[PDB]
Amino acid sequence: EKNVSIVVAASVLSSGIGINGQLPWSISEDLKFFSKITNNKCDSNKKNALIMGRKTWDSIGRRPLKNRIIVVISSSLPQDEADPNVVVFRNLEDSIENLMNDDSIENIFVCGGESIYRDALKDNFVDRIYLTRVALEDIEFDTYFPEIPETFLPVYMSQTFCTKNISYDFMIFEKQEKKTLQNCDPARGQLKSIDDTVDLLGEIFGIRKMGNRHKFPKEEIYNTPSIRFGREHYEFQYLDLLSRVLENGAYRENRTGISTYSIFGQMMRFDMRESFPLLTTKKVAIRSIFEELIWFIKGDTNGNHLIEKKVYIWSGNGSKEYLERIGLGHREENDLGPIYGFQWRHYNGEYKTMHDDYTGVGVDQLAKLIETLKNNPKDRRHILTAWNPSALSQMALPPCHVLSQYYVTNDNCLSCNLYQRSCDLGLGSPFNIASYAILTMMLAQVCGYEPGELAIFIGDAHIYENHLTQLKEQLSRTPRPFPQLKFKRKVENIEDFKWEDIELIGYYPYPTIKMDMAV
Amino acid sequence: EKNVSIVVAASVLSSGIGINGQLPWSISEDLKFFSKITNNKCDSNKKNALIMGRKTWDSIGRRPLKNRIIVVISSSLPQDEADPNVVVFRNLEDSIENLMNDDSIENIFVCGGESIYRDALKDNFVDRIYLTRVALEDIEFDTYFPEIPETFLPVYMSQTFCTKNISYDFMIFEKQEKKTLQNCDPARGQLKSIDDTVDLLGEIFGIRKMGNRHKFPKEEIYNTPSIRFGREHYEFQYLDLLSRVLENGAYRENRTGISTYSIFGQMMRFDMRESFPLLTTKKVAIRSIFEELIWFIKGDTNGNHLIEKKVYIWSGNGSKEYLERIGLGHREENDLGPIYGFQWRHYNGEYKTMHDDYTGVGVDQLAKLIETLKNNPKDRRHILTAWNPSALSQMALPPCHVLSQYYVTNDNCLSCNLYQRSCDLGLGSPFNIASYAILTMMLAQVCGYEPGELAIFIGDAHIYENHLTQLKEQLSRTPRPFPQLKFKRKVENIEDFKWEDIELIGYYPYPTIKMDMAV
Ligand SMILES: NC(=O)C1=CN([C@@H]2O[C@H](COP(=O)(O)OP(=O)(O)OC[C@H]3O[C@@H](n4cnc5c(N)ncnc54)[C@H](OP(=O)(O)O)[C@@H]3O)[C@@H](O)[C@H]2O)C=CC1
Ligand SMILES: NC(=O)C1=CN([C@@H]2O[C@H](COP(=O)(O)OP(=O)(O)OC[C@H]3O[C@@H](n4cnc5c(N)ncnc54)[C@H](OP(=O)(O)O)[C@@H]3O)[C@@H](O)[C@H]2O)C=CC1
Ligand SMILES: C#CCN(Cc1ccc2[nH]c(N)nc(=O)c2c1)c1ccc(C(=O)N[C@H](CCC(=O)O)C(=O)O)cc1
Ligand SMILES: C#CCN(Cc1ccc2[nH]c(N)nc(=O)c2c1)c1ccc(C(=O)N[C@H](CCC(=O)O)C(=O)O)cc1
Ligand SMILES: Nc1nc(=O)c2nc(CNc3ccc(C(=O)N[C@@H](CCC(=O)O)C(=O)O)cc3)cnc2[nH]1
Ligand SMILES: Nc1nc(=O)c2nc(CNc3ccc(C(=O)N[C@@H](CCC(=O)O)C(=O)O)cc3)cnc2[nH]1
Ligand SMILES: O=c1ccn([C@H]2C[C@H](O)[C@@H](COP(=O)(O)O)O2)c(=O)[nH]1
Ligand SMILES: O=c1ccn([C@H]2C[C@H](O)[C@@H](COP(=O)(O)O)O2)c(=O)[nH]1
């Protein structure tokens, strides 16, 4: 045999790869990738062959690629016996015989030309596809990468990387077809002895064997199942937690009338250095998120201000009937109480109403946090809490994102840890992830650092039963690279941030998915 | 070919397997295991053969095992043509030819007899060893399982299970010898395309690719490296976190004079249904742990009481010079301040000295916790906190185990979640794990539930540089099954627990490892 892989970089939405004989963007890392991958070979005494259309050959500047051999497909171009590292062929099929000999040629790469790509696929000449997904879709394109035939399936999807604020992925598709079902769990299949034993041990003991209490998700509820050992994109941190409760979540009632399926004690990780964790498998209402955040930062608890800026997430838990219902009927229409923010800027403060001027009262954690963060970074007490046993009863809703800790890496990056007691994976989480990601970025700009990593530890991770068809729909969408989020100016004080100060570069999510909140 | 596996159950320390022709214990699950494993076959038309010494044959009661074929090795016993499911052989070697034919015989199992075991190993007839480790070592034994030859290596170690309070494991050794180094990471080796790509991608980007910031532990610092895909025992949750910081921990200074190597945002899981998470790779001072816990429960803050019961963990952070040093020189010799416990039983209480009678002051979280736990189990607010922004300055030490949440499973089990801001993996963690495990058990007995699961989320997980050789020593020890911890009586009130009320059944740890605390 002999392998044939495609290497291409196309826009995330329309698979745009070229414009007037040029790449529609310039990302050196991707060129470096192309170089690394197409040079990568086992036999020092062999070379790899890169097949390309004549037009691409013109794009390269008709000059050979080091250590490799360029194979140009063209009807006109002369079979120049001159350069040995370059050879011409009249049709794609003929060139492919690199297999049929030139044992000097270890591997084959179809390097480009919408035409050459399309033909390679049509004649089923390719085994693999190395696809760099570039996140910029509103620019001119005149060349495209054909749709990947169904005989191909994704086996790996890298995390998102940034270059000049352009987001991008790296994922490889393999043309697998053989073999039946297969187990989605990547731990199995390593050696039958283990698999068999654990299975047997699982029959003897039942729910007694903890493993049986944490069953790996079934294919039908596992996002992009084919990527079994390469679920690198951090959106799988969420998608999997989703299918993980969908698999083990215990059906249970709660204070609202809508029951949920839940599991206890979970975690998700998110990089923030190369991208912003704004879920792509569903359009997320980032503005509302933001406006809720500064609201907290300000120490505001007047739910009208959010409504005024057309942000209604706190309407439900803020209505007259809800307050009445929870023994706060004395409270004004939207005075949510000593909730987040009040506890952030006025911890332990004696709350009256959302109208009083609490300036000076309580403990300003946010202030101290920022101060400690920049004056004693290696400090191990960079903590922010909203769980006040004394204030709970006055809150419209007990703090869900209970406590967060901050860490300053040796290389001056700011990471964040958040412990959430209760998490609505359907509505909450998406917001929650973005929110604390932003807060970290703000804290970072203000303290002179850059975003590091975001880790969230969940207590009661649940899915409201009325979100089942919706989240199933969402789990059917393959993740796209995360976008980038940047501040347009350096604020002096953390509370000066405004919506206009934010830039969401390259966000191309799937259509929004409607889901109803449980009051 | 044809496989030959040993199936045996021996005591954890001396490999005791028999006493006066009887098993020195009775665990039905293990017999059920033996049955499952020795019956487990691919070809419906074949049977498995179980080889055993005559004495064991007498132990079985000289009656065949269903669906299988018993092969008795004996010099005297008649070659009875009678029972077809039982056949006799004069020597071990001869019997092994089950391979050499009887294609009706799919697999071979060496089922016992210290003598038969010893010979099977000595003549290198066995491929695998299924070893059930039983945790009871102070009983008479007259038969033993020989030491496993070095050609054998452990590839799997189950979680710990209980039966009549006896703890036990299930681990399988495979006689692997071939192949060089091999990567410890179980994610690699699944398919070169992925591995290669990630490696290359890792060269292009550096610390930029998050993965490179979370490098998998190197073999030399990985506990029992051979178990690559079977690290089921939950003590690996700790051992690995250990080697994980040892691999990526950033060297950094802190308030004490001893620097540490740390990583941010980690987690560990522990089952509590079938065993008690008391590390075995090092003898752990469980009594001190306990005495510190009720101390907290009581709401006590007088560090003398611990010293009085010969518990000195809080001496350091309690001395006159330490208090002076942290601006609490006005405080009495061991009045630690509104620390854990005071915040547990008197949250937000106005602290004076360890002598005042705080009865009635503050918020009794522990009390409410217990009440909420039993009156509204599915409740999602079962929280306990020690992080009081207002009290911090009066504490000898800021709360390390910051906040914990509790969950009551549908099957009435009580699980626990703990967020720890700072964790000394060398000294703290071991204590920390046991401590919160016990607290959960107590809360459970008192609320009418049984222990579920314990999950710990770490913020600054670090290793003090002066614990390096010690933890290296510890990482060289292969885990033994966790013990069992039971209460000898049902207390009426949670604070009535006494050391005498506890039973640590089957704890056989490795020798204690001395490590010094950083003040
Ligand atoms: N984003 C990415 O990863 C990549 C992007 N690109 C972009 O794509 C564009 C170039 O591709 P595209 O316009 O399709 O041109 P291609 O590079 O495929 O080249 C087309 C030429 O190849 C020869 N050819 C193609 N098919 C045949 C055939 N069946 N028989 C004989 N000769 C054949 C012809 O040359 P002749 O006329 O001389 O006979 C044809 O004009 C550029 O904009 C380039 O930047 C290119 C590679 C990768
Ligand atoms: N914990 C566990 O997993 C297990 C525990 N056990 C325990 O071990 C004890 C039994 O084992 P142990 O005392 O060694 O006895 P074994 O079961 O090995 O049986 C010994 C007998 O096997 C025959 N035999 C052994 N070697 C040879 C040989 N080289 N050539 C010919 N015949 C041979 C002899 O019988 P003959 O005299 O008739 O010639 C010998 O007396 C019991 O207490 C039993 O409960 C047993 C299996 C498993
Ligand atoms: C987390 C958090 C903060 N919060 C506050 C908040 C208050 C009470 C709660 N109650 C329950 N049961 N679950 C929650 O997630 C929840 C969240 C949120 C509340 C609603 C939505 C929501 O419906 N979001 C959009 C719809 C509105 C929009 O488009 O802006 C969505 O459907 O995704 C998001 C966040
Ligand atoms: C966690 C926690 C509570 N604590 C309180 C406490 C207070 C200050 C701290 N300071 C630092 N830097 N690290 C700590 O782990 C730490 C822990 C502990 C303190 C010491 C030991 C300790 O030395 N344990 C034994 C020795 C004593 C014994 O045998 O009883 C050991 O060496 O394992 C354990 C727990
Ligand atoms: N993922 C991907 N990215 C690409 O840029 C790419 N480019 C083409 C075609 N042509 C281009 C043109 C020039 C170079 C080039 O100069 N490559 C050199 C230098 C790379 C570097 O180190 O920057 C090489 O060594 O391959 C690469 C691709 C086809 N498939 C691709 N596929
Ligand atoms: N791990 C292990 N446990 C054992 O008990 C064991 N026992 C022997 C030898 N003999 C004994 C004697 C009787 C039975 C027995 O009756 N087995 C039946 C019933 C098992 C059940 O369902 O309880 C079988 O089906 O194998 C098992 C082992 C050898 N290796 C072992 N190895
Ligand atoms: O940042 C947030 C704000 C609150 N909620 C949701 C989680 C729960 O669905 C609900 C609180 O439920 P109870 O704890 O009151 O039962 O609020 C979130 O998920 N994240
Ligand atoms: O239950 C406990 C008691 C405290 N410590 C340790 C962790 C840190 O090593 C030290 C506090 O360090 P700083 O946060 O003060 O830097 O106390 C624990 O690990 N666990």
Side-chain angles (χ1 to χ4, degrees):
Chain A
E1 179 47 358
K2 188 117 65 172
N3 220 58
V4 168
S5 308
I6 275 187
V7 183
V8 60
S11 65
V12 58
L13 298 191
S14 63
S15 300
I17 67 168
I19 179 64
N20 309 304
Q22 292 176 166
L23 292 171
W25 57 66
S26 64
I27 304 173
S28 52
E29 293 89 345
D30 174 52
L31 279 172
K32 208 170 196 302
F33 178 64
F34 169 101
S35 180
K36 286 286 175 51
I37 208 66
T38 63
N39 250 134
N40 179 53
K41 67 182 191 194
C42 287
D43 197 317
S44 94
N45 280 164
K46 296 183 177 193
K47 289 189 164 205
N48 283 324
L50 316 201
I51 299 176
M52 55 175 82
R54 192 210 78 235
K55 284 195 165 76
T56 292
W57 174 230
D58 294 333
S59 302
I60 289 270
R62 301 198 179 192
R63 303 182 105 100
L65 290 174
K66 196 151 176 296
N67 322 301
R68 289 150 289 179
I69 286 186
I70 296 180
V71 173
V72 182
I73 272 64
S74 177
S75 71
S76 63
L77 224 161
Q79 262 83 35
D80 58 284
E81 273 309 352
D83 206 322
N85 314 298
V86 194
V87 68
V88 180
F89 279 92
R90 296 307 171 196
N91 78 286
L92 182 63
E93 193 189 65
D94 257 287
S95 77
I96 301 189
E97 48 77 316
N98 281 293
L99 312 164
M100 224 61 279
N101 69 169
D102 235 335
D103 295 319
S104 41
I105 282 56
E106 188 169 271
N107 308 292
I108 298 162
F109 293 94
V110 173
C111 299
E114 171 169 355
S115 67
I116 300 293
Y117 283 138
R118 192 170 296 294
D119 275 355
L121 283 314
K122 192 180 89 294
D123 297 345
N124 220 204
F125 290 144
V126 29
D127 291 330
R128 207 194 321 289
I129 298 179
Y130 287 92
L131 190 247
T132 307
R133 304 194 290 178
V134 190
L136 71 197
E137 202 66 54
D138 285 85
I139 62 171
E140 231 209 304
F141 287 127
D142 58 35
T143 302
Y144 299 87
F145 185 67
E147 290 317 284
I148 302 176
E150 285 164 52
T151 43
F152 280 93
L153 282 168
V155 309
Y156 171 81
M157 183 189 290
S158 74
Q159 70 176 72
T160 302
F161 292 103
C162 162
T163 295
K164 304 180 186 177
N165 284 175
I166 306 181
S167 299
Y168 53 108
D169 274 323
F170 286 105
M171 55 188 288
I172 54 198
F173 297 69
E174 231 135 306
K175 189 176 157 201
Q176 48 176 285
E177 56 287 87
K178 175 135 51 66
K179 301 188 55 52
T180 182
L181 166 131
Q182 188 53 278
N183 202 300
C184 285
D185 182 357
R188 321 192 80 264
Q190 308 313 135
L191 66 175
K192 193 170 71 178
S193 54
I194 295 190
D195 289 7
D196 281 353
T197 298
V198 170
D199 284 346
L200 261 36
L201 222 48
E203 311 185 319
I204 295 175
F205 302 96
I207 314 72
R208 294 177 61 193
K209 182 180 160 55
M210 209 177 125
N212 275 62
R213 275 177 268 143
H214 293 71
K215 295 185 173 170
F216 195 95
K218 254 107 71 296
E219 177 157 313
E220 46 258 54
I221 54 177
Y222 204 38
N223 179 289
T224 305
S226 37
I227 299 176
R228 194 170 158 209
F229 318 89
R231 331 193 88 234
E232 213 189 85
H233 186 330
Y234 288 90
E235 193 177 326
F236 288 121
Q237 291 287 312
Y238 168 87
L239 290 174
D240 294 348
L241 168 53
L242 223 58
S243 45
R244 203 149 58 243
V245 321
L246 229 46
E247 185 65 48
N248 317 70
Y251 188 78
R252 51 158 60 195
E253 72 279 34
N254 52 260
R255 32 165 300 256
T256 89
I258 306 75
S259 302
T260 72
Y261 286 91
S262 85
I263 58 178
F264 189 70
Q266 288 299 115
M267 86 161 152
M268 296 183 285
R269 272 214 172 69
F270 295 100
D271 174 55
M272 293 186 287
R273 298 199 188 193
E274 297 292 314
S275 71
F276 184 75
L278 186 63
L279 304 179
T280 60
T281 60
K282 161 180 73 163
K283 193 170 85 175
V284 182
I286 189 66
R287 193 184 109 274
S288 306
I289 291 173
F290 171 76
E291 219 63 57
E292 179 205 60
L293 214 201
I294 20 73
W295 181 58
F296 288 147
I297 294 172
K298 299 285 193 55
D300 205 333
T301 67
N302 178 166
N304 295 149
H305 301 170
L306 270 297
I307 305 177
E308 277 169 41
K309 296 161 185 281
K310 295 180 186 176
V311 174
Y312 318 107
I313 49 183
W314 287 92
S315 286
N317 294 74
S319 69
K320 193 67 179 180
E321 304 74 5
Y322 178 68
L323 273 43
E324 212 75 37
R325 178 138 51 69
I326 61 174
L328 292 177
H330 67 292
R331 202 63 78 61
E332 167 174 335
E333 183 61 302
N334 269 104
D335 185 344
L336 303 181
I339 65 179
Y340 317 105
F342 181 88
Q343 289 307 313
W344 281 16
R345 312 309 299 296
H346 313 294
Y347 191 74
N348 276 322
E350 179 172 54
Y351 196 76
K352 307 166 80 170
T353 63
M354 60 186 209
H355 298 133
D356 305 75
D357 170 47
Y358 299 99
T359 175
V361 61
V363 173
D364 199 351
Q365 304 187 67
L366 190 56
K368 295 186 179 55
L369 189 262
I370 297 177
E371 231 36 52
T372 312
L373 276 179
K374 49 194 179 180
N375 289 75
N376 191 41
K378 304 277 196 290
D379 191 61
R380 294 185 294 214
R381 294 97 94 101
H382 302 300
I383 293 178
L384 177 61
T385 178
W387 198 259
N388 196 313
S390 289
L392 292 179
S393 46
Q394 308 187 301
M395 301 167 94
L397 199 52
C400 285
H401 41 111
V402 167
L403 174 156
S404 55
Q405 164 165 44
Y406 299 92
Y407 187 84
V408 179
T409 63
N410 277 192
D411 58 321
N412 301 300
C413 276
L414 183 65
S415 294
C416 169
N417 268 179
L418 168 71
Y419 182 80
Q420 174 142 286
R421 73 183 181 65
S422 187
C423 188
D424 171 356
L425 286 325
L427 254 34
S429 214
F431 265 60
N432 273 118
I433 301 172
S435 194
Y436 270 86
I438 296 180
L439 172 62
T440 309
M441 303 184 118
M442 298 182 157
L443 286 174
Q445 196 209 77
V446 169
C447 296
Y449 303 126
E450 297 193 298
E453 286 168 37
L454 171 63
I456 303 182
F457 308 111
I458 321 295
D460 188 330
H462 54 280
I463 290 185
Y464 282 92
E465 71 192 324
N466 62 165
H467 289 169
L468 267 54
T469 47
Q470 291 64 56
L471 295 175
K472 235 75 92 79
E473 162 61 52
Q474 189 170 172
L475 277 169
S476 76
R477 307 172 178 184
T478 303
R480 286 167 181 162
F482 278 141
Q484 293 301 315
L485 178 153
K486 302 305 181 190
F487 296 126
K488 310 183 83 175
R489 74 199 181 71
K490 190 178 191 302
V491 307
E492 64 177 9
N493 197 299
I494 188 170
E495 36 223 297
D496 301 347
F497 277 104
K498 308 292 166 53
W499 182 223
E500 301 61 53
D501 295 339
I502 300 173
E503 265 193 301
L504 228 198
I505 302 86
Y507 187 43
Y508 301 111
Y510 283 75
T512 125
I513 297 172
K514 239 294 287 306
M515 288 181 265
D516 309 318
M517 170 163 109
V519 184
Chain B
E1 178 47 358
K2 189 118 65 172
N3 221 57
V4 168
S5 308
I6 274 185
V7 184
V8 60
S11 66
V12 57
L13 297 190
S14 62
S15 301
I17 68 167
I19 179 63
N20 308 303
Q22 293 176 165
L23 292 171
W25 56 65
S26 64
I27 305 174
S28 53
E29 293 89 346
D30 175 50
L31 279 172
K32 208 173 196 300
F33 178 63
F34 169 101
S35 181
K36 287 284 175 52
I37 207 67
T38 64
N39 250 135
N40 178 54
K41 68 181 190 193
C42 286
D43 196 315
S44 93
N45 280 163
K46 297 183 177 193
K47 289 189 165 205
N48 283 323
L50 317 203
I51 299 176
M52 55 176 78
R54 191 210 80 234
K55 283 195 165 75
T56 291
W57 173 230
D58 296 333
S59 303
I60 289 271
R62 300 198 180 193
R63 303 183 107 100
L65 291 173
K66 196 151 176 296
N67 320 301
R68 288 150 290 180
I69 288 187
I70 297 182
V71 174
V72 183
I73 271 65
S74 176
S75 71
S76 65
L77 224 160
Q79 261 82 35
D80 59 281
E81 273 309 353
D83 205 323
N85 314 298
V86 195
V87 66
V88 181
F89 278 92
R90 296 307 172 197
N91 77 287
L92 181 63
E93 193 190 64
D94 256 287
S95 78
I96 300 190
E97 48 77 317
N98 281 293
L99 312 165
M100 223 61 278
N101 69 167
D102 235 333
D103 294 320
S104 42
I105 283 57
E106 188 169 271
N107 309 294
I108 297 161
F109 293 94
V110 173
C111 301
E114 171 168 356
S115 67
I116 300 295
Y117 283 139
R118 192 169 297 293
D119 276 353
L121 283 314
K122 192 181 89 293
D123 296 346
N124 220 204
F125 289 143
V126 30
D127 290 331
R128 208 193 322 289
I129 298 179
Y130 286 92
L131 189 246
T132 307
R133 303 195 291 177
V134 192
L136 71 198
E137 202 67 54
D138 286 83
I139 62 171
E140 232 208 303
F141 288 126
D142 59 36
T143 302
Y144 299 87
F145 185 69
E147 289 318 285
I148 300 174
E150 285 164 51
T151 44
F152 280 94
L153 281 168
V155 309
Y156 171 83
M157 184 188 291
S158 73
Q159 70 177 72
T160 302
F161 293 102
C162 166
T163 294
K164 304 179 185 178
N165 283 175
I166 306 181
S167 298
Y168 53 108
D169 274 324
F170 287 105
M171 55 187 292
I172 54 198
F173 298 69
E174 231 135 306
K175 191 177 155 202
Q176 49 177 284
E177 56 287 89
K178 175 134 51 64
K179 301 187 56 51
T180 181
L181 166 131
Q182 188 53 280
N183 202 300
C184 287
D185 184 357
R188 321 192 79 266
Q190 309 313 132
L191 67 174
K192 192 170 72 177
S193 49
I194 295 190
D195 290 7
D196 281 353
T197 299
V198 168
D199 283 346
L200 261 35
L201 221 47
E203 312 185 318
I204 295 176
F205 302 95
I207 315 71
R208 295 178 60 193
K209 181 180 161 54
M210 209 176 126
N212 275 61
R213 275 176 268 145
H214 293 71
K215 295 184 175 170
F216 195 94
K218 255 106 71 296
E219 177 157 310
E220 45 257 54
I221 53 175
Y222 203 39
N223 179 288
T224 306
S226 38
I227 298 175
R228 195 170 156 210
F229 318 90
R231 331 194 88 234
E232 212 190 86
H233 185 330
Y234 287 89
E235 194 178 324
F236 288 122
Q237 291 287 313
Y238 168 86
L239 291 175
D240 294 346
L241 169 53
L242 223 57
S243 46
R244 204 149 58 241
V245 320
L246 229 44
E247 186 65 48
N248 316 71
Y251 189 79
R252 51 159 59 195
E253 72 278 35
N254 51 260
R255 37 157 225 111
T256 89
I258 306 76
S259 303
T260 72
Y261 287 90
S262 84
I263 57 179
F264 188 70
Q266 288 298 114
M267 86 163 152
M268 297 184 284
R269 272 214 173 69
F270 295 101
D271 174 55
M272 292 188 288
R273 298 200 189 190
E274 297 291 315
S275 70
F276 184 75
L278 186 65
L279 302 180
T280 60
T281 58
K282 161 182 75 162
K283 192 171 84 175
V284 183
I286 188 64
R287 193 184 108 274
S288 307
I289 291 175
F290 170 76
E291 219 62 57
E292 177 206 60
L293 214 202
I294 20 73
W295 181 57
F296 289 146
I297 295 173
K298 299 285 192 55
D300 206 332
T301 67
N302 178 164
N304 294 151
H305 302 173
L306 270 296
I307 306 177
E308 279 170 41
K309 295 163 185 280
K310 296 180 183 177
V311 175
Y312 318 108
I313 50 184
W314 287 92
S315 286
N317 294 73
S319 70
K320 193 67 179 181
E321 305 74 6
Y322 178 68
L323 274 43
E324 212 73 40
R325 177 138 51 68
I326 62 174
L328 291 176
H330 68 294
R331 200 63 77 61
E332 166 174 337
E333 183 60 302
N334 272 103
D335 184 343
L336 301 182
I339 64 179
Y340 317 106
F342 180 87
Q343 289 308 313
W344 282 16
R345 312 309 298 295
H346 312 293
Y347 191 75
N348 276 323
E350 180 171 55
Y351 196 75
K352 306 168 80 174
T353 60
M354 59 190 210
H355 300 134
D356 304 75
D357 169 49
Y358 299 100
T359 174
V361 62
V363 173
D364 199 352
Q365 303 187 68
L366 190 55
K368 296 187 179 55
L369 190 260
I370 297 178
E371 229 39 51
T372 311
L373 276 180
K374 49 195 180 180
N375 289 75
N376 192 39
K378 305 278 196 288
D379 191 61
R380 293 186 294 215
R381 293 98 95 104
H382 303 301
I383 292 178
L384 176 61
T385 178
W387 198 261
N388 196 315
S390 291
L392 292 179
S393 47
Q394 309 187 301
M395 304 166 91
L397 199 53
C400 285
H401 41 110
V402 168
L403 173 156
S404 54
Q405 164 165 46
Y406 298 91
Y407 187 83
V408 181
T409 64
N410 275 194
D411 57 322
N412 301 301
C413 273
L414 184 64
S415 295
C416 170
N417 268 179
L418 168 71
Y419 182 80
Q420 175 143 286
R421 71 183 183 66
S422 185
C423 188
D424 171 358
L425 287 325
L427 253 35
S429 213
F431 265 59
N432 279 329
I433 301 171
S435 196
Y436 270 87
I438 296 180
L439 172 62
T440 309
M441 303 183 114
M442 297 184 158
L443 286 174
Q445 196 209 75
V446 169
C447 298
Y449 303 125
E450 296 193 297
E453 284 168 38
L454 171 63
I456 303 181
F457 308 113
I458 321 295
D460 188 331
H462 54 282
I463 289 186
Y464 281 92
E465 70 192 322
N466 63 164
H467 290 169
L468 266 55
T469 46
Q470 292 64 58
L471 295 176
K472 236 74 92 79
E473 162 62 53
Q474 189 170 173
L475 277 169
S476 77
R477 308 174 177 183
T478 304
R480 286 166 181 163
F482 278 140
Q484 292 302 315
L485 177 154
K486 302 306 180 190
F487 296 125
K488 309 183 83 175
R489 74 200 182 71
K490 190 178 192 303
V491 308
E492 65 177 9
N493 198 299
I494 187 170
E495 37 224 295
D496 303 345
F497 276 101
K498 308 290 167 53
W499 183 223
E500 302 61 53
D501 296 339
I502 299 175
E503 264 195 301
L504 228 199
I505 303 84
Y507 187 44
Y508 301 111
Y510 284 75
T512 125
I513 297 171
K514 239 295 286 304
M515 288 182 267
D516 309 318
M517 170 162 111
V519 184

